[PDB]
Design a protein around this ligand. Sequence first.
Ligand SMILES: [Cu+2]
Ligand SMILES: [Cu+2]
Ligand SMILES: [Cu+2]
Lengths: 172, 172
Amino acid sequence: HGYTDLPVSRQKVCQNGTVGGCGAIQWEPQSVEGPKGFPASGPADGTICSAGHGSFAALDSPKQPNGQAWPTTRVNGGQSYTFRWQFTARHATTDFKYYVTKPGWNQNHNLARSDLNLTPFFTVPYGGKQPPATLSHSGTLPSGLSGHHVILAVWTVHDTGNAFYACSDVTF
Amino acid sequence: HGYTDLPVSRQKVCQNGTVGGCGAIQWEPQSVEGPKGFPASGPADGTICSAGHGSFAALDSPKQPNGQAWPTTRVNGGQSYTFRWQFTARHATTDFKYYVTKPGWNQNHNLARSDLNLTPFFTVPYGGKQPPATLSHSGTLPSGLSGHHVILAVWTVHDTGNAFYACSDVTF
Ligand SMILES: [Cu+2]
Ligand SMILES: [Cu+2]
Ligand SMILES: [Cu+2]
């Protein structure tokens, strides 16, 4: 159980007071768990950011619950960046993978595989080890992007069929 | 790292003073480690009880180093028995399997697959968990046997290619 707080994920902006109206997620931003094996398996298109949980469907919407744009973290393409997770349960881990949207992605529907560059821009094989409660690691942000984009962080848990999914809105 | 002390294994009778002349094993009865996947893979025939270690070859001999019979533990066929391991390192574990020799096995050469009933008489799937430093579990001894037999205990370590092998001489 955990989420990304750098770049801050939708579940965390719902918990932290930045976005109102998100429903159940606001009490448990750590809980966005779904099947592993993205993109071949894992949550269905349009339910990626909620990991398939109907109770967390606000996270999949292209807008925050009030219809305004999601808040974004400003980032610089091609620059190193600290990606950070906060965990409430530090499970043995297979890997962390980070994906970005493609130029021209559909910003007006729920995020889907067709919006994403499905080769991760940053991968951390983790060898079955247990992360610290706050894990910070450096990766290089993708180049060639401008404007609103989504970074999808996927944490795959060792000796399970599960992964945690965290969509973060960024501006390149 | 570990060995069986019930029924007492060859490496432990070498360490405990019961059998002299065994070489390096007497200082490290916990160390009889070889490839997993017995019987299809694992130590070669004639090196099973040493797990393939030339330095522990005394364990594979049909006699103790002085040429006398190995000491044996008297057991009753068809009766429940406490099998016990002592560990010096409590690794995450896949399983424990226990095998017995067949009637008419070749008592005059180094133990081989052809001497063994290769369906274990007792198996403990362990789910990747770490055993306690002393693990005792109950299994039913095979029936239909008399005289000198060998019980082979195999401890397979999770997320490795390795297992620990321990041959014990018994009398049915
Ligand atoms: Cu968890
Ligand atoms: Cu494991
Ligand atoms: Cu060990």
